[PDB]
Point group: D2
Chain length 291, copies 4
């Protein structure tokens, strides 16, 4: 069921915004986000290695936790999530509907606080941490599914791929495929918040772009495939998410707004025949309380 439903998502051209921008719509996944792919890969790996006797505990900003909970619900794994109290309340409710357990961690501690608590619960319960920031299967999910899909959906002609970095899974897996095919003929652009520009060589900080900018450089981030880093302001991301819904009818989340805002800045630096691709990580109904 899950193996079959996850991936093979559609791409749309954003004609009412900039007709050079194509948005891959990951909300079509059964868990409602891109994170279904890495969750599936990391889980199948841990099962075959015999690591899930006591279930799974994973820190999350929301989406990876929802994906793990969904797959765990179907496959019969106990799932515990830790997540900062600052993530949208919709996340908490979804996790509960999926019968997962949740421990909220302090907002000012961000993703590091969630990781810390997850490490504790893992030791206390014996639940296995998939560790999205270090697990190479996160990258393999995008290397073997997302990247191949994007490559063919764009008819093997792409000038730039633009993606927010959360775990770094998406840009790394997709970037490996695209650099493999295009070499220097394609630009791979990482997106991060202006408020937390760690990839640009700056300081971590509080920001509102849920799902990106963890405040540190993930171990799985494959820097050799990344050409540049662009920053996006919080209000830029929200504005674009809202614009996508009103002008394209696309019910996409905050990080999709950030991706598209950044893709627009990329496309403007290039010619009229530029082909720019980005991802819409999730849907707008996960953000009704704040978007």
């Amino acid at each position: 069921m899950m193996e079959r439903l996850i991936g093979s998502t559609p791409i749309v051209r954003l004609d009412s915004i900039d007709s050079r921008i194509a948005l891959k719509l990951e909300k079509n996944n059964p868990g409602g986000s891109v994170k279904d792919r890495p969750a599936l890969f990391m889980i199948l790996d841990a099962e075959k290695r015999g690591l899930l006797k006591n279930g799974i505990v994973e820190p999350t900003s929301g989406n990876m936790g929802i994906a793990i909970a969904m797959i765990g619900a179907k496959r019969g794994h106990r799932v515990i999530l830790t997540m900062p109290e600052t993530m949208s309340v919709e996340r908490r409710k979804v996790l509960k509907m999926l019968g997962a357990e949740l421990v909220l961690t302090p907002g000012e501690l961000g993703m590091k606080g969630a990781v810390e608590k997850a490490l504790e619960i893992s030791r206390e319960t014996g639940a296995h941490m998939l560790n999205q920031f270090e697990n190479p299967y996160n990258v393999y999910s995008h290397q073997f599914t997302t990247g191949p899909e994007i490559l063919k959906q764009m008819d093997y002609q792409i000038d730039a791929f633009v993606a927010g970095v959360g775990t770094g899974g998406t840009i790394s897996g997709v970037g490996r495929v695209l650099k493999g095919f295009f070499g220097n003929g394609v630009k791979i652009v990482a997106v991060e918040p202006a408020k937390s520009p760690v990839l640009s060589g700056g300081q971590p900080g509080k920001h509102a772009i849920q799902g990106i900018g963890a405040g540190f450089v993930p171990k799985i981030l494959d820097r050799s495939v990344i050409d540049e880093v662009i920053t996006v302001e919080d209000e830029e991301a929200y504005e674009m998410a809202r614009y996508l819904a009103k002008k394209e009818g696309l019910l996409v989340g905050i990080s999709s707004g950030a991706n598209v805002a950044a893709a627009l800045k990329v496309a403007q630096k290039l010619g009229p025949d530029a082909r720019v691709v980005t991802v819409a990580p999730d849907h707008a109904e996960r953000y009704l309380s704040i978007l």
Copy 2:
């Protein structure tokens, strides 16, 4: 964009519930429900007839309104919805995100109250009412998309198709295709609330199964393709929706719970090799406030 994204949704087998039941997952549509199909068909028809000079006004229990708003947002139509105040608050928020206008009508007046207000606004603004309860394009959407999809996805072997009646579009369009192919070899079962059993020959009444049981028999309901009517209690529908999320990882709405609860009663009356198909009209995140 919309023409391309709408439809071609997947089917899953509910092994952790009853392995004779296959659920078509309509939440994969870009508007997050089955209603994307009839909305697209009715809109394309009204455009080609030159009826949308002043936009669209339609009454809704939520999903048809969201679909119309989404397509209107992309195609450039002004969209006004009327909807009972008793429908989930998520509906109202989505309509606003899509830049549609909304007039809430009294809860005790139900769908009839919404229709009445929509007729008023139509006259006042000149906006065109697509009229989901009378428009044959509602039925054609399921006759030309949903039904053909279901027929092939089930490898041309179906013992029963089970669906809630809202507008009656789905059961009518799908039932025409399936009766066309199977004749009396397939049973077509209409689902309604026990609290409002109009199709069984009873009285209209207040119920909690959002999206079904409008309290009257729609004009587009094709009674010649319907074999029986089954009733479902409110708590049955909610319980099943919850069970689908916890045991299958399927984030489906209330009417999906009602469909599956009814499909289970159908399958139990049949043999161990029975093939029963139903629809999951929408997703669970449209119901976080109440489910």
Copy 3:
């Protein structure tokens, strides 16, 4: 296996011939032709009615024989095919590969001799005749699969659908759907050989356009959906089939050249933004010794 592989074929636009024409590629079917669809439907229907206990006998000089032989091979039905002995060594070989029993009837004579022999085999062995020219399930296969596919693949915008009539199944089933959706907004154009223009009111004659022009009006032909008839000369058909290979890289059969030759004549009488769709029934490699 066959239920899964048959149908859902791609469409392409004929940019090197006329960019207003779109070509549905039925050679992508496992039997290499459009006839996989009606054969499947006729066989599933006959199975369901318990009519296949002593196998299948069918008189056929064309793709229906391959489709039947192929489905019969997988499903475990005995398949006897009657064919005038004038049929190519290419076709005999394929039928024999699929384990059909070939009954060759006296030649110049023709298809009548094959029909007569099939009727006696049916009496002598109990084998069931599907009768492709009379069986409504031929039409339903197109009403329930091909037409729905085309409608959506053309994003619900079609000014004309153009198709050769062999059995009349394709034009009738697709025509029903397209008339249903578009009404008089779509023109349905039947194609036939200039040498055998029976649908135009003329006399049957010998022609070389494989797959079309039986020299009678088939029982299953839905005349109510057909707006006009257009004729194609044998050499128009062969020349266009060759051109499709040469300039589009499309290895299509003789009937495909006929369809596209006709569609070209249709398109030229319409505006610059007209949308014309037609079918490529089979593949070139079935005709290497004559094309």
Copy 4:
């Protein structure tokens, strides 16, 4: 057109042969073989490097010539193919249909003569040689399309992948993906003729298994992904190809019988629930005079 049609081919399970075997049907490609993928990738790469101004010349006796001719026809590249004059009238015809220029070199001699003639044509005309045995884009086509497809189509569960080596492109690219995902959990099995077992450490010889066993080790063969080599006799291959047609209704070529014959040998050494996947490179109707 070609970017859209190539790849995304179906898999079937060989229930009438051994239900542990799954067969990827590459005949569904517009060129009727697996070689559409590497041809597309090699040509797109060469175009991008501006290497195709005077066209393409390639020495090829098999499906690569068809793929190149077909892509060349649509894209507007001059295609010259060199082939020993010992090649069938069937293949010459198809190549000529696609508008390739056929350069026939002295026979018994063989493929070396064709390579030598291509090298001089390249010098004399400026035409660019893709060199399918050395070009890494042959491997990438499978790494980026075929392997990703197989991984998902098998629901991420594969005990063995079995494939004939022609160029070694298919086994290398798929093998990279499957090794990447499964590690030592998957066995990658290369197939070659008993008459020409060079990968097994033996001597090159003449054989009748079309599409495999070039009688050298191709430069692009990723030996690091191959776990074992298995041999197949010419008559094993032809017999299995015939059986696939007869009992599965699958019109597959000679190399497909070889692959399935090998996969059968593999499956028999494994448990009852083993999952073995293999490829059907091309179709039967390309071999009517010998199969």
